[PDB]
Amino acid sequence: MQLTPFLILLRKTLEQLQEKDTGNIFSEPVPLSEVPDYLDHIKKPMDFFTMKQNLEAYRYLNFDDFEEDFNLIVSNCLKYNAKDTIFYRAAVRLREQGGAVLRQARRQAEKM
């Protein structure tokens, strides 16, 4: 646990993104057992737990790779689900609120 300012920032940012997911519907992988066709359409599933595991294994080297995985959580959800669903509407809201979190966090990352 030799921390860096960058990794601390990513940890804080991930917590701020998860706070926007008040129903915790993006906290864990979409359960493939409950949805057997998910991988037929979604090439790379993503969720906040997987992102936390990547972070704790020190696999995010820059802000772009971190943001790319967040964007997968949203875009996977919009792709798989019909527009008139709780999941789709939640992904739209997360894109909006999470985008603001990422804008502020990238500004802090830029001055590192």
Two structure tokens written together for 59 = 């696999």
By C-beta, is 30 or 109 nearer to ligand UWX?
A: 30
Among 44, 86, 89, 104, binds ligand UWX (CB under 6 A): 86
**What is the footprint of ligand UWX within residues 54-73 (CB under 6 A)?**
none
> Considering the rule CB under 6 A, would residue 48 count as an interface residue with ligand UWX?
no
Pick from 1, 3, 76, 5: nearest CA to 41: 76
Helices (H), 23-85: 38-41, 48-56, 63-80
Minimum CB distance to ligand UWX smaller for 6 or for 88? 88
Structure-block tokens of residue 67 = 């943001």
Name which of 107, 109, 89 is nearest 97 in CA terms: 89
The residues in 18-47 that bind ligand UWX, with binding defined as CB under 6 A, are 24-26, 28, 30-31, 34-35
Amino acid at 108: Q
Which of 16, 50, 71, 81 is the binder for ligand UWX (CB under 6 A)? Answer: 81
Residue matched to tokens 């915790």: 24
State the residues that interact with ligand UWX by CB under 6 A. 24-26, 28, 30-31, 34-35, 77, 80-81, 86-87
